[PDB]
Amino acid sequence: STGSATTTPIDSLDDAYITPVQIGTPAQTLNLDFDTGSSDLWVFSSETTASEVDGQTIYTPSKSTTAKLLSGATWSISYGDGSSSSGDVYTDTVSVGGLTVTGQAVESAKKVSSSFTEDSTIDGLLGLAFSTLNTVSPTQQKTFFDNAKASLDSPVFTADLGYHAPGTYNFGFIDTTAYTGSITYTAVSTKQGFWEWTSTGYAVGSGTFKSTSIDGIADTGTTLLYLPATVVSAYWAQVSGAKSSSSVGGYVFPCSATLPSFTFGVGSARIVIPGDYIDFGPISTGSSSCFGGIQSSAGIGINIFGDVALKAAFVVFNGATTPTLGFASK
């Protein structure tokens, strides 16, 4: 089997991407944030605290003839950005772009933090990291990909995120028309439950390539590119007037600037992030200070190849017995 679904930016800055997902019988379609950096499929629901729901579409398990309470199961998750959610668990039929999994753990939110409430466009998350990170207790549950894998034509999914445009998540096949040149594959460590890999280096604009190992994760659920402070300083030093602002919480730059590209290495291959991808607009409405799309990972504990990096590539998440990651230009 295969599946193919369109993923759409939630706003003009590509702050996140949403993908329609069918849950239950008859189908309830929710728009979920596909997140290769976490492993829980959770949704706004009929069980979510009423004051914490603001415009989201909710899952109502009582209206699904295939929903079953997973007795005694609870979940609770906190993401690196301060956000969190928690609740109980159903199993139900879940379909993405024509690919169907029966008995998928659908984690129903009883509580969500303010940042989730404030995103009216995101109805929940669909985790695509390794199932060892799943937070359901006392019986850990499998991701949608993990459940689908044996049935897929090939045990893979691909992320093709657009810049200011829709893109595609495919399951079970590689669309050879969706990228240019070849796909370069690189080793993955699953030791921390992430799609963790080692970039071979970077360049700023037309500058020389610096060969240096940068361990990080491929994370579709993180907006920006978070890299070591040395690398990030080298980037913003090429932008006149750019500086790190403790009050704003990262590097900012004059909105009148023209941003240089940023290149990262995948083996001997190179992925080029155009300068425009690194612009996240005025820090507040009407401001001439703009927020940068490359930021320091110093306070995080891990480097994160988020959407800013990933949307410059066609990315293969290869879930073979020994997982690997593939990157192609597009």
Ligand SMILES: c1ccc2[nH]c([C@H]3CCNC3)nc2c1
């Ligand atoms: C900013 C700070 C911390 C962050 N942690 C994350 C990801 C890492 C894996 N799941 C959450 N994005 C972040 C953005």
